[PDB]
Nucleic acid binder design. Sequence first.
RNA 1: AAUUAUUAUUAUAAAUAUUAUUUUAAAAAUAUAAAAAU
Lengths: 413, 694, 55, 147, 214, 52
Amino acid sequence: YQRGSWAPGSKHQKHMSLNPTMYLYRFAGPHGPGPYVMKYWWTLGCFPTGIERPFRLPEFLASYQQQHVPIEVEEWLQCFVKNPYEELKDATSSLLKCLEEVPIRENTRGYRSIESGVSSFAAPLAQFERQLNVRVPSLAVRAALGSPALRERLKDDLFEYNESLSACGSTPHRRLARLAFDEPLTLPGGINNSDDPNPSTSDDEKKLIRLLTTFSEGCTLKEDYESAFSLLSSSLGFSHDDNTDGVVHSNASAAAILGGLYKEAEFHGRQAALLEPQAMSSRKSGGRGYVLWATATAYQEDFDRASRIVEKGLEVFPDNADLKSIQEKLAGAVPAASSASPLCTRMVRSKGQQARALLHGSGRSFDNEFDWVVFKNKLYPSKMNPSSNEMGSVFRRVGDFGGHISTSRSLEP
Amino acid sequence: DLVGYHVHRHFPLLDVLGCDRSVNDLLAQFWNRPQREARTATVLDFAATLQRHSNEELTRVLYELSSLFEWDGNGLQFIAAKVLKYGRSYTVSSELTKAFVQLVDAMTVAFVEEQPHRLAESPALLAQVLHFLALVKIMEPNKWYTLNPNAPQNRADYTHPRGVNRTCGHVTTGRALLDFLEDMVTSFTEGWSEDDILDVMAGFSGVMPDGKASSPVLYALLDELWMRWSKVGFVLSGSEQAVRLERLYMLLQVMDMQRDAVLDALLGGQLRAHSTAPSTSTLPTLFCERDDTPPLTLAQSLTQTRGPDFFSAVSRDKRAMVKAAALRLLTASLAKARDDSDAVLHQALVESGTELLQSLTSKSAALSFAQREQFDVITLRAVPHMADVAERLAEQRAEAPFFPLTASAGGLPDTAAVLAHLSSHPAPYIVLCKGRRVHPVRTLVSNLDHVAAVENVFLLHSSGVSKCVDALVAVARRLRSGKDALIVTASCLRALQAAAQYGATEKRRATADRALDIVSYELEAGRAILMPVTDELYLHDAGTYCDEDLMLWTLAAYLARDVPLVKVHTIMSSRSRARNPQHALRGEHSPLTSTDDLYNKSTPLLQALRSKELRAVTHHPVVQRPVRDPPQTLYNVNPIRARFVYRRDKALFDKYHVTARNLAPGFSQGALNSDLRALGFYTPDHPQVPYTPL
Amino acid sequence: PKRKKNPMQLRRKTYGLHFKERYLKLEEWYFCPLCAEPKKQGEWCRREDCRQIKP
Amino acid sequence: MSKQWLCREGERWWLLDARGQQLPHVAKIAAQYMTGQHRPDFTPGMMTGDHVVITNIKDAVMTGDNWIRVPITWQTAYPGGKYRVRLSEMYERDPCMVMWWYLKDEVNRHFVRKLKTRTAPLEKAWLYEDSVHPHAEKNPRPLVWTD
Amino acid sequence: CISGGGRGDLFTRHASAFKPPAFGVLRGLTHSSQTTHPQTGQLRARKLIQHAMHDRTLSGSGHHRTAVATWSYLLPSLRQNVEQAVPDTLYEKLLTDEVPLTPAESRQLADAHRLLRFELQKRIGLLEDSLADAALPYLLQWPALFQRAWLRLPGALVPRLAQLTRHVIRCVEEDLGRLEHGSEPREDGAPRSRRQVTLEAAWRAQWASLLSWH
Amino acid sequence: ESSITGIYRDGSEKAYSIRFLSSMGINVRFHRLVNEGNDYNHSFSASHLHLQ
RNA sequence: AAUUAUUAUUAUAAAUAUUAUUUUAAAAAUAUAAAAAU
């Protein structure tokens, strides 16, 4: 009897005569509530022994007492938010005030030098985008400062857009204010608080996108495409005229092939296929509106749809060297494309999907469909899978509910 | 096509497959297919046809396979795996080690028993069998199984009757042949020219485990090199015959045979003189072996301006006059070379020269000659990416502007902490060269102040930058902490330049470029510290030959005494025999040498190699290996997959049935790395596909 | 037990192969050229393609 | 084997013609030379040894019937494994096994404690039952000694 | 990290890092005699002890360590020192008006006076090295620092601050004299010198602004 | 702090606790920092009678 | 019965509800349990 100590959280054996316990299922150890007695503290409410008492206070001072604003303060606060045209004309000036001071990436041979740190401008940049709602990965603006071709184009595309924001006003703002201003009404939604809707992509709204691709140009130079795809396709809310719309629709599809998404590479290219031809087809931009909407199919393995778009690009646009080579690039896979044409053989090509299945993909011995099926955002243990009545699943033994015999079986209702 | 051999003459009785490939078409296969499974079916396919091939082809294929070997270390070290059945590990020699042990087993039958006439005819063949039999270290088969020199295996040496090491038991490959080759040198050589009498004398030294050559073997050629001389009368002056002495004197230095007469002539006859006109002193120059060696002088001819072989050779002779006698012949050789305006003779004479100065007792006279001859300049011109720095390190004044270099009694650079005074001048920073290469090169003696402010100084060794550069590269980064450092030597540079071009495999020579790109372009940026020849002479102990294996250590034994605050690390491979300078590299035992040898101010810095303390104060951190990611073993043989090559699998597929999914035809067990097709096998009743790349 | 085990003796368990062949082993794998996830050779997906042909 | 505490650098190659000399005594002098005790620089840590070549073993001597009444006894692990073997019974098997056993009695005497010192001095003696021995090139100098 | 900052860091362990007498003294105890007379302070019985103590800062013998030696770090570091120990409210009343701030703010002006004399004395040896590869964008704030510390810009530090400040001054005018005839820095990626006009003009502007000050 | 401390011309040092130590026992400890050289902690054995 | 544990807690009433918890791809001893005869 009584080999260890006398506390209930002791280590060795005990006896119920000498040291009579109260049967405490699971209590907290001497070093704090582990993650097992907290599975109750957030579901049961209190520790499962019942003896401990649920001091839920400092959470109440975390959520509620923080989120309390009386009625006579609620309606007035929004009248006190900042003028994000300012933290757009102030941060962009500060963001530059650091982007100028970031070291030129070293160039010593024998070993790749390490890119400059990013804590310098992470704080102002956090302000720029947070008002724009287009979140940029610091790597884009950390490899850009590193690349010898982009360290200057990027920084100066900021100095110039900063110019075309401290000269004009934040035009994607007024677009939201002119809603509250047009459709004749004496209410403009403030005096527009952005200077001193039927416009096209304004000056800034073009230079805004300008540095976004120049942001997304550092992404490709580091080859992180599916974050670049969130940079380009986010600027897609900034073009309202179909000239630049097709340009930025060419950028997104010029970043979806690498990113691995070969379906959306068509759509982003098919819009480049309906907005491109307005200019003289002699420049290398004329042909580009169609190639992506047909290269994305030479990448999607359906060569017969691709065999027609490169045909439709021949008629309109006279000679696009890229579109010309795809005409013959489709003659090397013949017949190995058309003879060997199965409807399902899709040999996954790039890394953007090789990487996106290392994450977000099913695993083995965990995260598979045999561990915890999720159903309506709620995790269900593998048994309770409403998408199968296979063995193990509790649906095998539901019954018939005293209602109609709906089964012909004998031992298996 | 499946052609190339023909079945034995009498078919239904013997089915053995002959051979009919041309030696070229074996070498082409040997080369275009360097994989082990093709490089085995070439050695074996050749050793079967070793009795037909001509004395010239025997010269070629032997001389050819050496391209796969390397004088440095383990000969047949083509291991398969290090099995870990028990606690410690043991090593398993691959099919390619058993292929040369098989090849050498077919040379010791053709040349010893069934054709003893084959090797006397062509003299250049024996002079190639010998050198081959040295590269394959057949006097020491244990290293064909040994991976870490510190961990010597006895796999090929020691067997136990319980049944361990039976099949790879006591190995005697050429010990039959290697000892018939000497029965051919004693008692013939009439058809041997002096270029081969030397090489044969160089074979029996190299092949021996330590270079001793069983002197009756050697002495049978020296007895024959005098008869080649007596017909000229020991007045030889062919300038190429004056080279075969500088080689005959480098040998008989590795062997250690001490014959003054060859030095009594190669030097010029200065000894046997300075032995005339004595008032009262010794007669050291003679050391007469007159009945054994012939009186020899060269002539009134050149008698001066020797070659590199001679200077690295006279290093071993401990005689005081011979060095001052050979210190002008280095000036003249550095005069004639400079005036001739040749690069190769200008570097060769220096890297073979420092070995001479590193032996004189007067370190001052050794340091004087090192700056009057721009040693820190001409040496570094050679090293691949060093030409940039050699320029800057040769700035017009501060190449070596007579630094304080205050040596005390005993020769030890007791300038430490009294050269830390520097004469108070701060060893200036940025100088000139507007392109902002303006940061001055960091010679040690000029920058000994920095190493004091350093937190942990690093030493580089030519191994740590071999097999990968991912360990130096990290230290290249930490250089810009200000607290750290990095010290490379002009020896470690040179000893990297060798393995930069003279490397067994391109995967290794490519490194020593990328391993010298950084250090030559981290020195020009004023981050690392180059210990130049002028300072390797400063730190080394006078009289001891301190190569890069000891410059890594005498530096860590200098600064672990003359600046004890800072750490010291050693970028090297755990396989270097210099990871333990106590076990290897220790000096002759002596009663006076203590364990306090390291810190005592009166002892030479290499006296501390007789202690485990020097290894204790010098750390040896593996800074950072490449990642531990496994290589693609999906293409190698797998004892688990092997059971699936022929496993019936009908009920596995439904629509897309193939003929035999698992079986890669032509390969061994579906292993796309173990390729065998079009290599010579025999299976008269099973198909085989011809060779294609992958 | 007859005594307690010093640490050099609890590590003795980790020398032999029965410990390394149970914990410290890494499996060869590869991306299914279709299923896009890592895989061992032999065990296949559920997709009708990853199941008809056997990558 | 390089392994500091070895010292193969100042070696001298002796030669002890065992002809007519008593086997319990040739095992003594040869031990002072393998253990390197004849050296004025002898420190027990260093195994500074000098190779001995004890040729002509089969001509050894054993005073009296000590060829018939001296056992080389060794008790193995198997129960009932105790082995007794005379000298005239081990001399049937291998004459060098009786000299290598009488050396083991002398090297052990001062070096039983550590395995590295028990066995390493034993590998320095080359027991040859007759004249022939492959060490002509090691110049075995005939050590002078009077029992 | 024992000894604190070998070369780089400001922090150290002197007279406020005590001697703990109750613990198993870690290393350097070569001999067992080192319990009653450890005799540290002796340089060899100290490198044994000092090395194995609190990590001689190395991040982990292969982990990434910081690049503090370079002008691209020290000088934008010194920017934050005086931009904190002397907020602009002191800079305005000093730069604009000559009137006395107050005793308090005059202490905060001298509290940070001898705070520059610290980060200088610690990180001066580093400043001279990366002066070679230092860039003009960073060689241009070296005078713009000693203003917010309110010190007239023009071994011991004074000998070495002079020669360095003279050394940088030329390298600034060289570059500024290298700008008037500026070669093509990028004929590609930015062959049009935009933002380079104003930013390098304001440099030449703000360079001579401090000259009359200094 | 109760400790006398001497700084030798090679960077080395030494301390000598003088807590509760009388004046005569401080001078004695004073004279013992000037004496030694603080260079080697050698055990006076028969092997280390001669340092060189 | 310390329990969500060896358990139909049954004073009474009863008779065709499939009325809703039991992992594992090896070998021995043991443990339950098992065709043929003095």
